[PDB]
Write a protein that binds this ligand. Structure first.
Ligand code: HEM
Ligand SMILES: Cc1cc(N)nc(COC[C@@H]2C[C@@H](OCc3cc(C)cc(N)n3)CN2)c1
Ligand SMILES: C[C@H](O)[C@H](O)[C@H]1CNc2nc(N)[nH]c(=O)c2N1
Ligand SMILES: [Cl-]
Length: 362
């Protein structure tokens, strides 16, 4: 039954993939090869070509992503060879470095060995490779509350955070056969960070805000023609709203709006003043300004949406269905100023694709 699943996802994936790659005539033979391997081993191994194209396809099918125009230039690193924890760690350091690229960020995915019998070869505990710790000490909130449970799980295993608002979590992960994950402190020289300043308002620096350059999702399974790559971290660059309007603004995250309001010299007393809205805008201006001042790639939600419009035209012109999740595609500020807001999307799940999977702690 799982063999039938795998076989079926394999047939559908290879036909689509080779058709796209112009290699249609090779399909029958490659499929025959695959059927034996699954008969003999209970699985199969992607070629380099397939793995790269599956990764890209998976990004192109990610309904919630506004950034998909650039799906086909994804930079795919194949690390199915890794067998040791040192090799996993060094792969992850390398990805950080090669994806950061001194600020000129490269959309990059590093692919580790797939699950076998639903048994994971490498289990990565981080949600993102770079992410800040979160603490809640008897009333006292420090850092990023999203990270509270992972931070506590790291601190079980003998890591200790300095308890700044921006402690970097260690890389933490578990190898098949070990009962406990290992953790490694990130080398600071690998992590770009950006101080948040405002173009006009010098006092904004009094907030002492910063964010990291590169968002590297490290907790989603990439699935390609029946094969389950649970450990396959990927990155793009940020859209400014993600930092400016959620990570720094949500009440359940850094919750900076009142402080923003103060330093930009408006009152946070009356809803009718639209102080949250004004503050959100200046904070978001800030973010894009600071990342550009520092040479770190970033996109604003207007330019992102325009690019996504182009992705829509391209799909149709290529004769492919478009899928999307309207609720995630719309930016959380000035959504109606984008074309996305004014149309609907088909939120079907097409594979290959990225998927959530259970967190090992919690
Ligand atoms: C190149 C620059 C990129 C930008 C600006 C971009 C932008 C976005 C944004 C704004 C979201 C919504 C995030 C949120 O609200 O939490 C998102 C979600 C997503 N993106 Fe993209 N992205 C980019 C690259 C990529 C790449 C390279 C992949 C895969 C290879 C990808 C796969 C996804 C997935 C799977 C989600 C949804 C994750 C979830 O459900 O939590 N993104 N991205
Ligand atoms: C690759 C990439 C580029 C870019 N500019 N931005 C991103 C944003 O990813 C962060 C978001 C926020 C996270 O929250 C949703 C979520 C929900 C649940 C239940 C589990 C989980 N792991 N993640 C997951 N993705 C990713
Ligand atoms: C479940 C509920 O719809 C939830 O608020 C969603 C909505 N839309 C979103 N859209 C984006 N881009 N990011 C998010 O984290 C959410 N959260
Ligand atoms: Cl984020």
């Amino acid at each position: 039954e799982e063999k039938e699943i795998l076989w079926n996802e394999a047939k559908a994936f290879i036909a689509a993939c080779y058709q796209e790659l112009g290699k249609a005539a090779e399909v029958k033979d490659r499929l025959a090869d695959i059927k034996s391997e699954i008969d003999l081993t209970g699985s199969y191994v992607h070629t380099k070509e397939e793995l790269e194209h599956g990764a890209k396809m998976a990004w192109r099918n990610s309904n919630r992503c506004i950034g998909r125009l650039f799906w086909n230039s994804l930079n795919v690193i194949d690390r199915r060879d890794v067998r040791t924890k040192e090799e996993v760690r060094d792969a992850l350091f390398h990805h950080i470095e090669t994806a950061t690229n001194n600020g000129k960020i490269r959309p990059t995915i590093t692919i580790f060995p797939p699950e076998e019998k639903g048994e994971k070869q490498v289990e990565i505990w981080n949600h993102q490779l770079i992410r800040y710790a979160g603490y809640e000490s008897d009333g006292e909130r420090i850092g990023d509350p999203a990270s509270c449970s992972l931070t506590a799980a790291c601190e079980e295993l003998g890591w200790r955070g300095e308890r700044t608002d921006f402690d970097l979590l260690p890389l933490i992960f578990r190898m098949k056969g070990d009962e406990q994950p290992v953790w490694y402190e990130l080398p600071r020289s690998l992590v770009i960070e950006v101080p948040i300043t405002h173009p006009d308002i010098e006092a904004f620096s009094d907030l002492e805000l910063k964010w990291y350059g590169v968002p590297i999702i490290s907790d989603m399974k990439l699935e390609v023609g029946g094969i389950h790559y649970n450990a396959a971290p990927f990155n793009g660059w940020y859209m400014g709203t993600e930092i400016g309007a959620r990570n720094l603004a949500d009440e359940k995250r850094y919750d900076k709006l009142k402080k923003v309001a103060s330093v930009i010299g408006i009152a946070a007393d009356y809803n009718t003043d639209l102080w949250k809205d004004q503050a959100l805008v200046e904070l978001n201006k800030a973010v894009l300004h600071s990342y550009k001042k520092q040479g770190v790639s970033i996109v604003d939600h207007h330019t992102a949406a325009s690019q996504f419009k182009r992705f829509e035209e391209q799909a149709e012109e290529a004769g492919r269905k478009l899928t999307g999740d309207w609720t995630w595609l719309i930016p959380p500020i000035s959504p109606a100023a984008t074309h996305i807001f004014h149309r609907s999307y088909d939120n079907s799940i097409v594979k290959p694709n990225y998927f959530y999977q259970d967190k090992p702690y919690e």
